[PDB]
Amino acid sequence: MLTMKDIIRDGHPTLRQKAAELELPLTKEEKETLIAMREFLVNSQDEEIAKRYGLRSGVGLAAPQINISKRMIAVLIPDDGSGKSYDYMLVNPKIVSHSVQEAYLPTGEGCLSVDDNVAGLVHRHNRITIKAKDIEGNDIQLRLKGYPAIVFQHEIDHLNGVMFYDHIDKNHPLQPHTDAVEV
Ligand SMILES: O=C(NO)N[C@@H](Cc1ccccc1)C(=O)O
Ligand code: NI
């Protein structure tokens, strides 16, 4: 199983590289590392396993964060309210379209790879369409709004060497953009 030992930290140069596109089919090694990335998120969300193994709670993980410079992401967003849950292991995820209207978490964002908290709103697209492959090479198209769109944008950022804190207005960090939706 993966643990916080496996997650590299702000300053590691792998987090600032552009992740390489994967060829398909995936190698067994690649499937296994993507299943383990999901398993980490699952483990990080069980309070007993997470206490026992000192896991931070996470809803998304990009392979660069375990120092693998490949374009795979895991998202595990539990039901929490609506009936909408998100459980996705994506290969070569790409945002193909998005809203002009922005969205932000009113408390800013966190990062398993970031030991500090950073204050500041991170404005993202309220709505996105993603095309990607699943672990078996089949085609996935996601239409996402609000919380999940923000999480996926966070994870895809990692594949392009971008960190949540790069989006933070240096002067007015807690000023919401006009007509930006609060999630
Ligand atoms: O750090 C990772 N993945 O990179 N995952 C974040 C996801 C996230 C995104 C935006 C706001 C809050 C949280 C986490 O702490 O669960
Ligand atoms: Ni992060």
Curated annotation (Swiss-Prot):
Keywords: Hydrolase, Iron, Metal-binding, Protein biosynthesis. The keyword Protein biosynthesis applies. It is an enzyme of class 3 (hydrolase). The keyword Protein biosynthesis applies. The active site is at E155. Its cofactor is Fe(2+). It catalyses: N-terminal N-formyl-L-methionyl-[peptide] + H2O = N-terminal L-methionyl-[peptide] + formate. Binds 1 Fe(2+) ion. GO terms for biological process: co-translational protein modification; translation. Signal peptide: none annotated. GO terms for molecular function: metal ion binding; peptide deformylase activity. Its EC number is 3.5.1.88. It comes from the Bacteria. Removes the formyl group from the N-terminal Met of newly synthesized proteins. Requires at least a dipeptide for an efficient rate of reaction. N-terminal L-methionine is a prerequisite for activity but the enzyme has broad specificity at other positions. Belongs to the polypeptide deformylase family. This is Peptide deformylase. The lineage of its organism: Bacteria, Bacillati, Bacillota, Bacilli, Bacillales. The gene is def.
